[PDB]
Design a protein around this nucleic acid. Structure first.
Lengths: 193, 46, 116, 115, 144, 147, 46
RNA sequence: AGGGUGAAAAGAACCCCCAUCGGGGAGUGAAAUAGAACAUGAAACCGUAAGCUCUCAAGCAGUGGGAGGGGGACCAGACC
RNA sequence: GGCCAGUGAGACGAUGGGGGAUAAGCUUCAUCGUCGAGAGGGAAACAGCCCGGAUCACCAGCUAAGGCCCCUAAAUGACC
RNA sequence: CGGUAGGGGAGCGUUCCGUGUUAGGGAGAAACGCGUGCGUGAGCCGCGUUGGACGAAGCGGAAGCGAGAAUGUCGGCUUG
RNA sequence: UCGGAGAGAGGCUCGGUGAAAUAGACAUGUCUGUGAAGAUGCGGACUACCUGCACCUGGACAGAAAGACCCUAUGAAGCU
């Protein structure tokens, strides 16, 4: 009897439509529908987002061009959007952030003597495996690990910064393969780059 | 050699249910042998 | 490692294994159909094919090697008077390894040896 | 004059009933039921004082992220510059609540802080 | 109670361990009497045979106490519990003595016929509840 | 003792779908209160107040039950189109409210213990709170600041 | 060698945050002009 | 070291499984979930069923906030 | 004064010294601060360092020490 | 109105006793389990398709009177 | 040196029977730092899907067993 699972499933979806209510977005929105003032007191408590507030479909998309941009301040201004601290919906327990795309990772500027003296060393578990590895060696070898190492220490390294680590999309080429949500260029507030 | 502490209900129900699931795996074989033992020309089980 | 060691040793030491082979192929030639374990079944299969084809050419030397291998006296002389009349033209493959239920108390994979 | 009793089992059964959903021997085993009652109550203390502190922090960063959407360099400190100079006594960071429940009304707040 | 559907058969504290009786009793859960009849004929366990004796004396029970058939009859729960454990003070070297417990089981197997109505269509009718008590005896997803 | 039977009254299922589809959905309209909104200052803390809401607050110094009480300490009164940004208080303001029966809130078990220095204190606290229902907001028609 | 390492509470008199800028010690809190007193919190209306 | 089925053994006639032990009907009893391991039966311990949930995760296992989901509901905003 | 206890192993930090090697989180003293018996905040963590003295509640505000790129609250603030 | 060693004041609970052959109780007492209740808390009160005969409160008294520790101890049952 | 092969009893798998020392609960990583001065439990970083089986024993200051060595007791005892 396939009609048991199918037809009772569509009856459960039908009473899901009849009992439950949708969650309206926060755009040109007033305080309450007249149904909402009869419901819970969501005013005097702190606003906490529901599942229809942090959908990854309608998140923002940002594209920087990392040509002649210095690394760490770009990493901080990518971090401040990768968290969601430019949105008034910022709750630090959910994923309110925005996807970012960093093209031209091969041409990221640094200041001083970072290129020959800053080491991206790593180590496995056994002794004597500490890998000597400098900035020009990655930028010659795999450049898109540079920025990916800069912003990974900018995000809260628990279960939630690991989830918004995948929002970072760094590509070394001049062109990114994304045409997802027509990615608008990233707004900067940094006068010294 | 001597155990430092004891195990939980957690790890014990895991290990005992791996033992009994290891008992589960050796009866669909017995269902296949009991099904082939039925009516059919099989050159076994005199 | 056991690369290419094609002797089939049982759970018994060497001379006890030889006595198990000789006694169980002796009573296999006595009753014909016999209940063994499967390791004992294949271990009977090689040696009892050697004893059917040993007295296939019924000379004195084959009869004396064959009497030397088998325990009982009156079963070797009932063998070469029976194997050319029955197992001529068979040209190998004198047994059958019909398996049965495992044994109560060990779950031992238990087999059953014919003469065909 | 023997004095066998039952009061340790009601004494102990109340603490047993409070220690539900404690994941294992913290929810079944008496000699840990006690110290999970204890540590649960002091957890309620420090997380209550720091829920006052923590929601203060949350409204500070929420209205900071609301004001910084103008683009021109108007920080959260300047919103309090011209929030106490223009005499608005103590909106108590509940403008971080109507900053998302009524974003046009907080645009009226800030656009009257400018004038 | 399911309105007179199941057949509950208990068991004596038989002289074997509970855990092996629980792997052989967790095998035969949910399967009907024919499949357990052929599997417990051939299961290579010593705990198999009193379980097969209690299944056989449980479905023969279900055919003589009730009047059912041994083909439309599935094993419902088949719970095995602990029993009494004897204590055997067995001596061992350097002057020591170990408690060797002789464990016993406590088998309770419940059987389940399908005594169904098999109604024609699904469509709900919110009328005559004193017939709705009798028309619905065993279903799923009870709303209100 | 048997399977019971099929029952035979020979019923006919009414598939008219103008009675069950009337019975199962419900028509419940929310009451239109009005397009108004204020933020009152009670005790120290401020409350989002809309006309008709069972708020909880602090006052148990003295307030009789079922009393009609004006909360005139209003800032940021707001309609649907315009809000009134309160230089501290919007003048001549009146949030009409109904101070209802007084309550004690949930138990807050204040149990303090330090460490092995053997000290532990189970005390409790029932905060003397008061539930207030809101009637309507008036006296707010000065200096509009619509955008 | 003969240079003693600074251990605990000597590490705390050395490596504690000290604001050794003579400007930032002079700072008092900001002063806004005084306001008239707010009205009554509520009023009996009969 | 091991006490207490009932008020009265009224201690289960008879049928089935079956070598017993045991179990299910039936019968006695107010009670058979009071069945001879027999009076109330708690915790540790072992289980089975139902609701939600865990397989990129670092944690004295809580607590504050609470996404999503489930249950009855009547002060339907509440409770678990 | 009456009745009636504990305590009499202290620790570090500043100053004044002796023992040492003006070595020790060393040892012994004299005045003081903290811990002991003190929670909270700053000190990454961290008894004795700075602010500070916890009756309790609030999904209140202003501050001390200390901070205002991100992790983590507040200035990628201004001028030398 | 922080608090260790410690000192003082005020209370809850338990079993028995006076009132007491108390009120109440096979129309369900004690027990055991339950709470959208009340207390500063020890605890009280209320509800139970479990159980089956005792026993409150108030005003008082007396203790083999309150458990998480003693490589405690006696039974039961785990881990490996 | 410089190990190598082979035969048994174990070890590995299956079926039966079935312990023990130990054990606060364990959701039981590495480096580095801090801390009663040798941390899975605190801090920062890095690394790790869950869970078995077979071996090895570096750590859990692993198990034993109120350190035989050292000192204290206005202890005990033998001997001179």
């Amino acid at each position: 009897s396939t009609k048991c699972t199918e037809e009772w499933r569509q009856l459960k979806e039908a009473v899901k439509k009849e009992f439950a209510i949708p969650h309206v977005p926060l755009d040109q929105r007033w305080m309450f529908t007249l149904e909402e003032a009869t419901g819970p007191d969501i005013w005097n408590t702190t606003w906490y987002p529901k599942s229809a507030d942090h959908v990854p479909t309608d998140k923002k998309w940002y594209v920087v061009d990392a040509t002649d941009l210095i690394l760490g301040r770009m990493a901080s201004t990518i971090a401040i959007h990768i968290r969601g601290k430019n949105l008034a919906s910022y709750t630090p327990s959910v994923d309110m952030g925005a996807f970012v795309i960093v093209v031209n990772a091969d041409k990221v500027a640094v200041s001083g003597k970072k290129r020959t003296q800053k080491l991206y060393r790593r180590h496995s578990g056994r002794p004597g495996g500490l890998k000597e590895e400098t900035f020009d060696q990655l930028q010659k070898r795999i450049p898109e690990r540079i920025i990916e190492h800069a912003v990974r220490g900018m995000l809260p390294k628990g279960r939630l910064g690991r989830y918004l680590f995948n929002h970072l999309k760094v590509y070394k080429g001049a062109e990114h393969p994304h045409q997802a949500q027509q990615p608008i260029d990233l707004p900067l507030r940094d006068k010294r780059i | 050699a001597v155990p430092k502490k004891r195990t939980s209900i957690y790890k014990k129900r895991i290990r005992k249910n791996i033992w009994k699931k290891k008992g589960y795996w050796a009866a669909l074989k017995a269902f296949s042998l009991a099904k082939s033992l039925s009516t059919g020309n099989s050159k076994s089980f005199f | 490692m056991k690369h290419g060691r094609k002797i089939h040793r049982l759970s018994r030491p060497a001379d006890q294994r030889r006595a198990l082979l000789r006694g169980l192929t002796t009573q296999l030639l006595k009753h014909g159909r016999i209940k063994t374990t499967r390791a004992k079944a294949s271990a009977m299969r090689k040696y009892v094919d050697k004893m059917i084809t040993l007295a296939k050419e019924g000379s004195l030397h084959k009869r004396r090697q064959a009497l030397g291998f088998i325990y009982e006296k009156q079963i070797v002389h009932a063998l070469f008077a029976e194997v050319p009349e029955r197992y001529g033209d068979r040209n190998g493959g004198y047994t059958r390894i019909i398996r049965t239920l495992p044994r109560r108390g060990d779950n031992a994979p238990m087999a059953y040896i014919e003469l065909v | 004059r023997v004095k066998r009793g039952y009061i340790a089992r009601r004494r102990r059964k109340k603490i047993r009933f409070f220690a539900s959903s404690f994941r294992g021997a913290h929810s079944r085993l008496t000699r840990t039921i006690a110290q999970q009652k204890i540590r649960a109550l002091v957890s309620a203390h420090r997380d209550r004082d720091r829920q006052k502190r923590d929601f203060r922090r949350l409204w500070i960063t929420r209205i900071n992220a609301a004001i910084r959407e103008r683009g021109v360099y108007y920080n959260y400190s300047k919103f309090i510059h011209d929030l106490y100079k223009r005499q608005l006594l103590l909106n108590r960071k509940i403008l971080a609540q109507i900053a998302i429940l009524n974003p046009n009304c907080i645009y009226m707040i800030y656009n009257e802080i400018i004038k | 109670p399911g309105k007179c559907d199941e057949i509950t058969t208990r068991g004596y504290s038989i002289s074997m361990s509970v855990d092996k009786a629980r792997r052989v009793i967790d095998q035969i859960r949910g399967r009907s009497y024919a499949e357990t009849l052929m599997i417990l004929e051939l299961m290579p366990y010593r705990a198999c045979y009193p379980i097969f004796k209690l299944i056989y004396s449980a479905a023969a029970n279900a055919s003589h106490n009730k009047q059912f058939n041994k083909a439309n009859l599935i094993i419902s729960k088949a719970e095995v519990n602990k029993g009494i454990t004897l204590k055997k003070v067995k001596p061992r070297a350097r002057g020591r003595s170990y408690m060797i417990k002789r464990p016993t089981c406590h088998i309770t197997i419940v059987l389940r016929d399908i005594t169904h109505f098999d109604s024609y269509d699904k469509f709900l009718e919110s009328l005559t509840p004193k017939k709705l008590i009798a028309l619905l005896g065993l279903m799923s997803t009870g709303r209100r | 003792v048997l399977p019971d039977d099929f029952q035979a009254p020979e019923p006919g299922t009414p598939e008219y779908n103008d009675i069950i589809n009337q019975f199962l959905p419900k028509k419940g309209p929310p009451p239109p209160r009005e397009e108004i909104f204020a933020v009152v200052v009670i005790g120290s803390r401020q409350y989002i107040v809309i006309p008709g809401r069972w708020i909880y607050t602090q006052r148990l110094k003295g307030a009789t039950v079922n009393d009609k009480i004006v909360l005139n300490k209003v800032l940021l009164v707001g309609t649907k189109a315009s809000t009134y940004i309160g230089t501290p208080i919007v003048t001549n303001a009146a949030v009409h409210a109904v101070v209802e029966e007084q309550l004690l809130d949930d138990k807050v078990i204040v149990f303090k213990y330090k460490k092995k220095k053997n000290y532990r204190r189970n005390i409790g606290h029932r905060q003397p709170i008061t539930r207030i229902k809101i009637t309507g907001i008036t006296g707010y028609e000065d200096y509009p600041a619509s955008t | 060698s003969s240079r003693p390492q600074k251990k605990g509470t000597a590490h705390h008199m050395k490596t504690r945050p000290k604001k050794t800028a003579r400007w930032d010690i002079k700072r008092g809190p900001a002063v806004y002009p005084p306001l008239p007193p707010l009205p009554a919190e509520w009023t009996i209306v009969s």
